Amino acid sequence: DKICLHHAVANGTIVKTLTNEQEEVTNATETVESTGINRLCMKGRKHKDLGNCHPIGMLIGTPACDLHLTGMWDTLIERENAIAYCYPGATVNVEALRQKIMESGGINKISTGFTYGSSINSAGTTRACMRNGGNSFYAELKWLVSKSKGQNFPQTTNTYRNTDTAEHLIMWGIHHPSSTQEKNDLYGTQSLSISVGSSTYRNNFVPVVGARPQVNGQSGRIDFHWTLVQPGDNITFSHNGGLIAPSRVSKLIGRGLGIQSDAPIDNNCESKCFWRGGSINTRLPFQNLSPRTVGQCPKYVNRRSLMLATGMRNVPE
Amino acid sequence: DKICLGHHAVANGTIVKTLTNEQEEVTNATETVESTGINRLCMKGRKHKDLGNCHPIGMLIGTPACDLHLTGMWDTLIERENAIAYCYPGATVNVEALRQKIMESGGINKISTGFTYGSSINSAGTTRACMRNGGNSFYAELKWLVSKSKGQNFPQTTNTYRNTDTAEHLIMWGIHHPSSTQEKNDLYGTQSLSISVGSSTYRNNFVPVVGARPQVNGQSGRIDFHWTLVQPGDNITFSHNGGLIAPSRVSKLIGRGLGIQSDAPIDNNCESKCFWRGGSINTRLPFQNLSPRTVGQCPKYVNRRSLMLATMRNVPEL
Amino acid sequence: DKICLGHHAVANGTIVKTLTNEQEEVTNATETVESTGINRLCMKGRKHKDLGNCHPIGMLIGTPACDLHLTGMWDTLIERENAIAYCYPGATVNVEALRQKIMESGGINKISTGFTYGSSINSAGTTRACMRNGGNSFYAELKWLVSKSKGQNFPQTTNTYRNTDTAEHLIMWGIHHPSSTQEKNDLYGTQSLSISVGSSTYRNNFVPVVGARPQVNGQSGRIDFHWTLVQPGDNITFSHNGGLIAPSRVSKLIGRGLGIQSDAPIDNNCESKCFWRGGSINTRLPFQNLSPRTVGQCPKYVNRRSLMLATGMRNVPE
Amino acid sequence: LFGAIAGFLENGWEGMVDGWYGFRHQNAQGTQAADYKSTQAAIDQITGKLNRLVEKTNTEFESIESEFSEIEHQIGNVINWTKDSITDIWTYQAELLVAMENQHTIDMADSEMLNLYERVRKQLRQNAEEDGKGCFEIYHACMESIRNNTYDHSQYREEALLNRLN
Amino acid sequence: LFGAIAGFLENGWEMVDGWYFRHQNAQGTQAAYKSTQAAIDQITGKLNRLVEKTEFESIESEFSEIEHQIGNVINWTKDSITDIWTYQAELLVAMENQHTIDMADSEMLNLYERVRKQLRQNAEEDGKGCFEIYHACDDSCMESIRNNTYDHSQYREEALLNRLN
Amino acid sequence: GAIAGFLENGWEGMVDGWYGFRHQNAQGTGQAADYKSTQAAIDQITGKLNRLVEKTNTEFESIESEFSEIEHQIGNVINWTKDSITDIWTYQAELLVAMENQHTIDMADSEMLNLYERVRKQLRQNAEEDGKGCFEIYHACDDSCMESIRNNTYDHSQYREEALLNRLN
Numbered sequence A: 001d002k003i004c005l006h007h008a009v010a011n012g013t014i015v016k017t018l019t020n021e022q023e024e025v026t027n028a029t030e031t032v033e034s035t036g037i038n039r040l041c042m043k044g045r046k047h048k049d050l051g052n053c054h055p056i057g058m059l060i061g062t063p064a065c066d067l068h069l070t071g072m073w074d075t076l077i078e079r080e081n082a083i084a085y086c087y088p089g090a091t092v093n094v095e096a097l098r099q100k101i102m103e104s105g106g107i108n109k110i111s112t113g114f115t116y117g118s119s120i121n122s123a124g125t126t127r128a129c130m131r132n133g134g135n136s137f138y139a140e141l142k143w144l145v146s147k148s149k150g151q152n153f154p155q156t157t158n159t160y161r162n163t164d165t166a167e168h169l170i171m172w173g174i175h176h177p178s179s180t181q182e183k184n185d186l187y188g189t190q191s192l193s194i195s196v197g198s199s200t201y202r203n204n205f206v207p208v209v210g211a212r213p214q215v216n217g218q219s220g221r222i223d224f225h226w227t228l229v230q231p232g233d234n235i236t237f238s239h240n241g242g243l244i245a246p247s248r249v250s251k252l253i254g255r256g257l258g259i260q261s262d263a264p265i266d267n268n269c270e271s272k273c274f275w276r277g278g279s280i281n282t283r284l285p286f287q288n289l290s291p292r293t294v295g296q297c298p299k300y301v302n303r304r305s306l307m308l309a310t311g312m313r314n315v316p317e
Numbered sequence B: 001d002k003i004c005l006g007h008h009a010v011a012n013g014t015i016v017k018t019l020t021n022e023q024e025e026v027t028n029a030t031e032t033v034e035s036t037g038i039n040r041l042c043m044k045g046r047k048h049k050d051l052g053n054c055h056p057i058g059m060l061i062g063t064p065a066c067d068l069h070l071t072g073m074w075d076t077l078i079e080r081e082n083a084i085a086y087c088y089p090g091a092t093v094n095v096e097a098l099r100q101k102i103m104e105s106g107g108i109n110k111i112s113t114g115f116t117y118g119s120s121i122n123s124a125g126t127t128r129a130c131m132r133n134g135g136n137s138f139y140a141e142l143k144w145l146v147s148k149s150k151g152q153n154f155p156q157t158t159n160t161y162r163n164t165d166t167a168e169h170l171i172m173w174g175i176h177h178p179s180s181t182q183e184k185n186d187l188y189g190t191q192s193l194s195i196s197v198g199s200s201t202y203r204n205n206f207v208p209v210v211g212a213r214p215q216v217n218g219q220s221g222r223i224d225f226h227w228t229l230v231q232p233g234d235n236i237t238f239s240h241n242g243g244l245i246a247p248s249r250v251s252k253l254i255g256r257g258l259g260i261q262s263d264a265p266i267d268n269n270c271e272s273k274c275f276w277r278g279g280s281i282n283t284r285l286p287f288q289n290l291s292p293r294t295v296g297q298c299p300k301y302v303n304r305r306s307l308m309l310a311t312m313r314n315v316p317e318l
Numbered sequence C: 001d002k003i004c005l006g007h008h009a010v011a012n013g014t015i016v017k018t019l020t021n022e023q024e025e026v027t028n029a030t031e032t033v034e035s036t037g038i039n040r041l042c043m044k045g046r047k048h049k050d051l052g053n054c055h056p057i058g059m060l061i062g063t064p065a066c067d068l069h070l071t072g073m074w075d076t077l078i079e080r081e082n083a084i085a086y087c088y089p090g091a092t093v094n095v096e097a098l099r100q101k102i103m104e105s106g107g108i109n110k111i112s113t114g115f116t117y118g119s120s121i122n123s124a125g126t127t128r129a130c131m132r133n134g135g136n137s138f139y140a141e142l143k144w145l146v147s148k149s150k151g152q153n154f155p156q157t158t159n160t161y162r163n164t165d166t167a168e169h170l171i172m173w174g175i176h177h178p179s180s181t182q183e184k185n186d187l188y189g190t191q192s193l194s195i196s197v198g199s200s201t202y203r204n205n206f207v208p209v210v211g212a213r214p215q216v217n218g219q220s221g222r223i224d225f226h227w228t229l230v231q232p233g234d235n236i237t238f239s240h241n242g243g244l245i246a247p248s249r250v251s252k253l254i255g256r257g258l259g260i261q262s263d264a265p266i267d268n269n270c271e272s273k274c275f276w277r278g279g280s281i282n283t284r285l286p287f288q289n290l291s292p293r294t295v296g297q298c299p300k301y302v303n304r305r306s307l308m309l310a311t312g313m314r315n316v317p318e
Numbered sequence D: 001l002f003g004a005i006a007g008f009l010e011n012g013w014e015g016m017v018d019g020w021y022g023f024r025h026q027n028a029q030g031t032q033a034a035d036y037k038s039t040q041a042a043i044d045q046i047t048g049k050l051n052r053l054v055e056k057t058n059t060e061f062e063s064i065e066s067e068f069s070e071i072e073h074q075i076g077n078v079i080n081w082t083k084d085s086i087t088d089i090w091t092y093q094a095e096l097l098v099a100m101e102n103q104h105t106i107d108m109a110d111s112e113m114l115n116l117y118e119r120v121r122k123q124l125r126q127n128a129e130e131d132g133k134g135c136f137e138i139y140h141a142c143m144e145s146i147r148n149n150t151y152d153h154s155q156y157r158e159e160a161l162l163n164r165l166n
Numbered sequence E: 001l002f003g004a005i006a007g008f009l010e011n012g013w014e015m016v017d018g019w020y021f022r023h024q025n026a027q028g029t030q031a032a033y034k035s036t037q038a039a040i041d042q043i044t045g046k047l048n049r050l051v052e053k054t055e056f057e058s059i060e061s062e063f064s065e066i067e068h069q070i071g072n073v074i075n076w077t078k079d080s081i082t083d084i085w086t087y088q089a090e091l092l093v094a095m096e097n098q099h100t101i102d103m104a105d106s107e108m109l110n111l112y113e114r115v116r117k118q119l120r121q122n123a124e125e126d127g128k129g130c131f132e133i134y135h136a137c138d139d140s141c142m143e144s145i146r147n148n149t150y151d152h153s154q155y156r157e158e159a160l161l162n163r164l165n
Numbered sequence F: 001g002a003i004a005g006f007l008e009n010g011w012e013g014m015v016d017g018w019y020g021f022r023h024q025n026a027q028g029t030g031q032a033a034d035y036k037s038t039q040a041a042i043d044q045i046t047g048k049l050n051r052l053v054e055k056t057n058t059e060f061e062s063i064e065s066e067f068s069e070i071e072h073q074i075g076n077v078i079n080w081t082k083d084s085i086t087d088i089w090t091y092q093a094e095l096l097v098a099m100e101n102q103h104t105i106d107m108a109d110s111e112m113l114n115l116y117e118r119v120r121k122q123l124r125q126n127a128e129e130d131g132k133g134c135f136e137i138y139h140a141c142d143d144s145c146m147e148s149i150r151n152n153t154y155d156h157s158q159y160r161e162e163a164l165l166n167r168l169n
């Protein structure tokens, strides 16, 4: 006449302990997600997919960036082969600036009220910039050239003036001609100089002629330079020509999440963590899909699977 | 006849967390994370410097606000929020790297260049942007070289400074950019202007630019500053044409020290090995949640309300 | 009658630390931190190149020290303290950047730029700083362009290198700044000098600058070195008025190697995967206290000389 | 560690599909049960759990390295070093956290078994002999007295003592 | 879990200096040193480890502003490090409390077994942490228990007769 | 509980094993080591040693020039990072060791108390509880009988009443 006092199971996953690897247990759960949604989950977020628009292009007015030149966004998205430059060119401080845009939350644009002398033809256009079928140019930039071929470009001064509450990012361009024959045509024979100075900036640019390969079928280059114009502070442009003067001035408003990804949008699904391959959602505190991520996220770890025991030791008879 | 065993208990037990329980109450628990920061700066034991409205870069080039702080050595360095770095409008290049050399540094000594100038040159330049005794002045450790005979060409000039001392020396000059072509012409003539600078380790060339700009401090003009290190037993040569702001004295940085960026008022009596923008922090506790940026031997910053560490399980009667 | 139960003990036993007691004797313990590192570079299994005096930059440029090491292949590259990258005094732009690319590089490869110069130009210019056989000489991948006729102005020239190969290429050229105007006049003439560089990616302008500078290696004149990447199928052009040090071959970093800055001598008959300046490390142990700076697959650096891990029971003696 | 599991008890009851801890029943009348809040005292802490694990200490991060363009080479390497180090931390931290809270779970699963067991043998008092396989030899004759905390020890102190002594 | 605090002992008595007796006899009716000193030292032992303490210098400025790209990198590294140290603070406190609770309970239960083995066969434990002693015990006997000078053998003869009949 | 508590000493004399048997018999007095119980401790110690040295590291590269200058601001940012990483790894090491020592010691403590219980409930009624970690046996137990107990073979039922007698009188 006796009384006896646990459960075991046919299959026990093995966890790791401080003394024992390979220790069978009645149930154990994964603490690392290794499967993540292929798509980007965008529920409950006001966002903007720039498509083949580069974030720099928004401020500059690249033709692909036309329906993006203003907006507001919780979230902003960038794509693999976005087009920043219509016309061959490089940007000074491009990475210092792209980040500024991808952590903003919208762009407002202001006209500069620039006004050019009757000596000056400001309707410059290139066939790098093809709006519908015609020669166009950057939406917020006027390519000044002297109106009569070869005739010397007049000394011109244009001053933007910030009267708004918050600082305005202002962008301008400098033109670098392909051949010395070409420089005289547009601006003239004179010694060129562009002097841009505000209260918290001074600089100066001098168009350089040189033999260069053809990019989008153009040899000449437009380098783009930008600065922030503080509230209550004017900025002055004095130029011989070769200035791609800003018709407009971008303003960056608020703060938003910036995603660089090739995954397609899905607004069915919710998330707060995105990477390149898309998105990751779970409450597992770890993850091994990708090391580089955006927004609130689980920390990256090397191991494919980590087993946390939810049960007692599994001992079959 | 009976004997019975048991443990204490308390009426209002405090609560704590474990690995198994979100809310466990316990006879006693103490604090593990600090929160009560002291607002003043606790500078006891430290030989220190409160620059007031003087910037550090101002020390090397001698702005008037900075006049008292031109030399000396410190346990620790203190910088106010509104400190004046430039009285005349200008910028410095690699200024952040420069400011940090100063903040890491224990002390500064100034050594004269020995520079001398011809009669045609006017060493005694001044501006109302920089004022001493309510009168126009220029930076203390720099000289503004213009032509004494107005309009006339700046004479070609050569200035060399030789680093005789065993220590490396930090040297600062300025490149003045005028506003008018009118203005540039009056001071330096119609010359094509150039400033070139060479040493064994450092080569660079500077060209002044006319530009139109809005007034700062009442001045359209700009003076941007540059700096380099002159290694010992070596010489740096200054070749200039008109536009140079030439050093009359040179900085030397001594030792390693703490640097503090704070606008909170000093309290000398209390002592701390920790500081932030508000005063100091005093604790044995290994964590803190005051502010994510401090300086010195400081506790680690954690984003929590508080974390409670138990000092047994409190079981009440029933 | 009785039967007892007991553990063992030893006459002398090791000391360990716990969460509640700092001081708890135990029968046995094992060290978990490694300090008995090694003093040679174990390069068995690793195809390696020992630079000696040549600095990595010198590989690309063509310095006389690395004249053996102009072209190579390795999974490891070993730099030395006494490194020499220059003969003629000069510095390089983005030097750390370029240097780091080379130290990552598993290889270097050289392609002739094939540039041709006219009758007026002298392809062979040599300096006494760079001596090969005895006879003066110059960097083995560049060429120093000067006028054959001492007085004469340099001819305006276009030189273009085209990258035919599938992979991207690294090309270095130099700009030479003369000590005095007369120097400048002999070498390149009295005309204003402009070097202009251009590629699909890359656009820049350089102007030689004349200034007095102190002699190094016996030369007041200076050479500044510049680099860029020529994308496959791209072409890069040099329009220059003189003062250009022009490439005669181009570089092509290959694969991935492992950069090592090390005072230690080679041992090609042991293996290892961690390296520091001192030597190499082989240990089972997780933590290490020798060097804060380490390279490769290495144990973490902890600010402790010893942590004892009890591998026995509480030791209680007679 | 505690003697109960993989100790004197020599396997588990794979037959049991209800509850971690139960009673195996033997007397002339009849022959398997389960003790309820020994196994939820246990579940309360097994589901004290993953509360630690899944509560999000979530700080929002931004992207410090762009994928679709050159990053400057020096700062590029500083970033790749800081992140490789922050990973080698969390991979440690994760590996310890599961391996230590596995060790804590596994060896707390008998504690309750032992406390159930010693509860039971304090109920039974001098009425039963242990037998050392976790079983209890009972030397007298609705045995859910012990299962449901009912059993009076004086009530059959009685003949059971002398069933031992014969 | 050790049986005592969350198991067979049902609550604590609101005893003055001592974490861990009460006995009942005809002429009188509380006592609590070695057991508690064994516990309290461990509490300080944990505290002492906590207090023990490198220097650090400012990398982003307060009153000027920092080049963007580097400012972001500084913020990201600084942020992620706080993330790690917060996890560590939360884990250590969580764990050391897990141990702290469950240590007092150890120094409780061993006192119980010390006693139960010391009365050997002259008492029965009744399942709630009271020991029922059949052989009569005056106060001066109780104190022979608290100072561990209690001899079982001499009472044993009287006990067994009471236990069996 | 067992080693720092009621078992007053450890025997230096024992060399074969961690856990020991020693008995008082009329024929002889002997020392015995339990192969099973010590083996359990040794297995869980070598398990910790393995987990300790089972570490594989991602290859790393230099971010600090040893033989050349580094720009001042970037240097400060690397210094602050490299030192903060180091501070974490030093605190993480002190944790590891101070935690796993706590556990190594107590694992060792319990394995003994488990052997002790194993003997005790094995004896059932033939013996009694001395807090010296000792059992008075109330019958003549000889040299075959002694590790009848350590083989764990020992059967109370055949000594039975003899054992109850002289416990009782």
Ligand SMILES: CC(=O)N[C@@H]1[C@@H](O)[C@H](O[C@@H]2O[C@H](CO)[C@H](O)[C@H](O[C@]3(C(=O)O)C[C@H](O)[C@@H](NC(C)=O)[C@H]([C@H](O)[C@H](O)CO)O3)[C@H]2O)[C@@H](CO)O[C@H]1O
Pocket: B125, B126, B127, B128, B129, B146, B177, B178, B179, B183, B187, B219, B220, B221, B222
């Ligand atoms: C009539 C009218 O609108 N008001 C003018 C008034 O604008 C002008 O004030 C002056 O403008 C000149 C240049 O246009 C200078 O900037 C004068 O200021 C100083 C200065 O203090 O900074 C004077 C000083 O002596 C100069 N230093 C030297 C020796 O070089 C500097 C210098 O020119 C600049 O710093 C160069 O960038 O300028 C300023 O008062 C006055 C007369 O100039 O006449 C009013 O009627």
Ligand SMILES: CC(=O)N[C@@H]1[C@@H](O)[C@H](O[C@@H]2O[C@H](CO)[C@H](O)[C@H](O[C@]3(C(=O)O)C[C@H](O)[C@@H](NC(C)=O)[C@H]([C@H](O)[C@H](O)CO)O3)[C@H]2O)[C@@H](CO)O[C@H]1O
Pocket: C125, C126, C127, C128, C129, C136, C146, C177, C178, C179, C183, C187, C219, C220, C221, C222
């Ligand atoms: C009389 C006296 O004080 N001693 C002089 C002595 O200084 C001078 O030595 C030379 O100085 C010239 C320039 O002033 C050169 O620098 C000479 O060196 C070389 C060199 O080896 O580097 C010679 C070389 O042929 C030159 N390369 C070419 C072809 O361009 C270079 C070149 O000028 C510089 O590198 C340009 O920066 O210079 C150096 O020996 C000699 C004759 O010059 O006369 C002594 O009496």
Ligand SMILES: CC(=O)N[C@H]1[C@H]([C@H](O)[C@H](O)CO)O[C@@](O[C@@H]2[C@@H](O)[C@H](O)O[C@H](CO)[C@@H]2O)(C(=O)O)C[C@@H]1O
Pocket: A124, A125, A126, A127, A128, A135, A145, A176, A177, A178, A182, A186, A218, A219, A220, A221
């Ligand atoms: C009005 C103006 O400046 N724009 C020109 C443009 C410029 O000449 C050029 O961008 C300056 O760098 O060139 C355009 O195209 C032309 C070609 O079709 C031609 O065949 O070669 C020309 C110069 O040799 C010139 O480049 C263009 O970009 O569309 C014409 C445009 O009006």
Ligand SMILES: *[C@@H]1O[C@H](CO)[C@@H](O[C@@H]2O[C@H](CO)[C@@H](O)[C@H](O)[C@H]2NC(C)=O)[C@H](O)[C@H]1NC(C)=O
Pocket: A213, A214, C162, C200, C233, C234, C235
């Ligand atoms: C770089 O120069 C080469 C050679 O001039 C250019 O490539 C030639 O490409 C064209 C059309 O793509 C062919 O018709 C020629 O046969 C090629 N020549 C050789 C020998 O390959 C190339 O287009 C230039 N690169 C750029 C970007 O302008």
Ligand SMILES: *[C@@H]1O[C@H](CO)[C@@H](O[C@@H]2O[C@H](CO)[C@@H](O)[C@H](O)[C@H]2NC(C)=O)[C@H](O)[C@H]1NC(C)=O
Pocket: B162, B200, B233, B234, B235, C214, C215
């Ligand atoms: C720094 O300048 C000094 C002086 O110009 C140079 O040293 C001297 O050498 C010249 C010629 O050999 C002598 O006339 C001087 O008397 C020397 N000065 C001293 C103090 O001995 C020195 O060579 C220059 N340094 C460099 C690196 O060029």
Ligand SMILES: *[C@@H]1O[C@H](CO)[C@@H](O)[C@H](O)[C@H]1NC(C)=O
Pocket: A161, A199, A232, A233, A234, B214, B215
């Ligand atoms: C901006 O321009 C307006 C008019 O040109 C002027 O009133 C104001 O002083 C200028 N502001 C600054 C900061 O220069």
Ligand SMILES: *[C@@H]1O[C@H](CO)[C@@H](O)[C@H](O)[C@H]1NC(C)=O
Pocket: B014, B028, B029, B030, B311
């Ligand atoms: C809690 O403990 C701390 C130190 O043990 C003590 O200062 C305090 O008086 C105790 N009681 C409370 C909760 O105040």
Ligand SMILES: *[C@@H]1O[C@H](CO)[C@@H](O)[C@H](O)[C@H]1NC(C)=O
Pocket: C028, C029, C030, C311, F049
């Ligand atoms: C001491 O510890 C080391 C490491 O665990 C082990 O190799 C050695 O066997 C131990 N000493 C003895 C006597 O067992």
